[PDB]
Amino acid sequence: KVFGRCELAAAMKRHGLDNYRGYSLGNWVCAAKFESNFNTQATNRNTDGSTDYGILQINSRWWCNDGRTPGSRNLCNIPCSALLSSDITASVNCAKKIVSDGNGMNAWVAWRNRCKGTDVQAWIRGCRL
Ligand SMILES: N#C[C][C][S]([C]C(=O)[N]C(=O)O[C][C][C][C][C][C][N][C]1[C](C#N)N([O])C2=C([C]=[C][C]=[C]2)N1[O])B1234B567B89%10B%11%12%13B85%14B%1158B%12%11%15B%139%12B%1061B%12%112B5%153B%14874
Ligand code: NA
Ligand code: NA
């Protein structure tokens, strides 16, 4: 599924991501924009053989099981395929664990490089939320 901006903002809110770990909703929408272009089916292979999955490009190195990342963990206790669904529940639950791991949203390199310290509220501007 390719979400619209406000559509995704709304979905994130309903699943309790807004202000989660102190990160306002615009931060999450901005991260999703640059991670996946709002496409729940987005996959990208990493140099090291891990893969990033879904709207927030969650990595198989730590967070999900894809059967082809040796030595990896599955801290969200989910198949990585779950992170590609139209329904974002699994992605949001896993992202809550990630953002709680010590690094905050710096766990998403695209957030640090393209959202941190910008007008992130712009991503939710205009939206009925
Ligand atoms: N951090 C910080 C300083 C904010 S100062 C600006 C400030 O305090 N403005 C604030 O009190 O405005 C009240 C209205 C807030 C509306 C917030 C929604 N819009 C935002 C925003 C947010 N939230 N942002 O974070 C922005 C932004 C526009 C551009 C960059 C960041 N923007 O339009 B400002 B002054 B110096 B150079 B001058 B300009 B930039 B830098 B500092 B920054 B901006 B002024
Ligand atoms: Na909070
Ligand atoms: Na894994």
- From the CA of 19, the nearest ligand is 2
Tell me, in angstroms, the distance from the centre of ligand 2 to residue 25's CA.
11
For residue 59, the surrounding DSSP H or E stretch is: strand 58-59
Instruction: Give how many domains the chain has, as a whole number.
Output: 1
For residues 52 and 22, is the Cβ–Cβ distance under 8 A?
no
Closest CA to 120 of 112, 90, 128: 112
Rounded CA-CA distance 30/104 in Å is: 15
Rounded CA-CA distance 118/112 in Å is: 10
Experimentally, how was this structure solved?
X-ray
Active-site entry in 18, 52, 87, 119: 52
Beta strand 58-59 pairing with 43-45 = unpaired
Which residue's C-alpha comes closest to atom 29 of ligand 1?
Answer: 119
Q: Quote the domain boundaries for residue 84.
A: 1-129
Q: Which residue is associated with the tokens 């140099």?
A: 47
CA distances from residue 5 to 39, 43, 94, 96 in whole angstroms, order as listed: 11, 20, 21, 20
Q: Is 35 a catalytic residue?
A: yes
Which tokens in the block code for residue 21? Answer: 């770990």
Which tokens in the block code for residue 49? Answer: 């053989």
Closest CA to 15 of 56, 65, 57, 72: 56
Ligand 1 site, residue 121, Cβ cutoff 6 A: yes
Q: Which residues pair with 52 in a beta bridge?
A: 44, 59
CATH number for the domain that contains residue 18: 1.10.530.10
Rounded CA-CA distance 81/94 in Å is: 13
Tell me the resolution in Å: 1.3
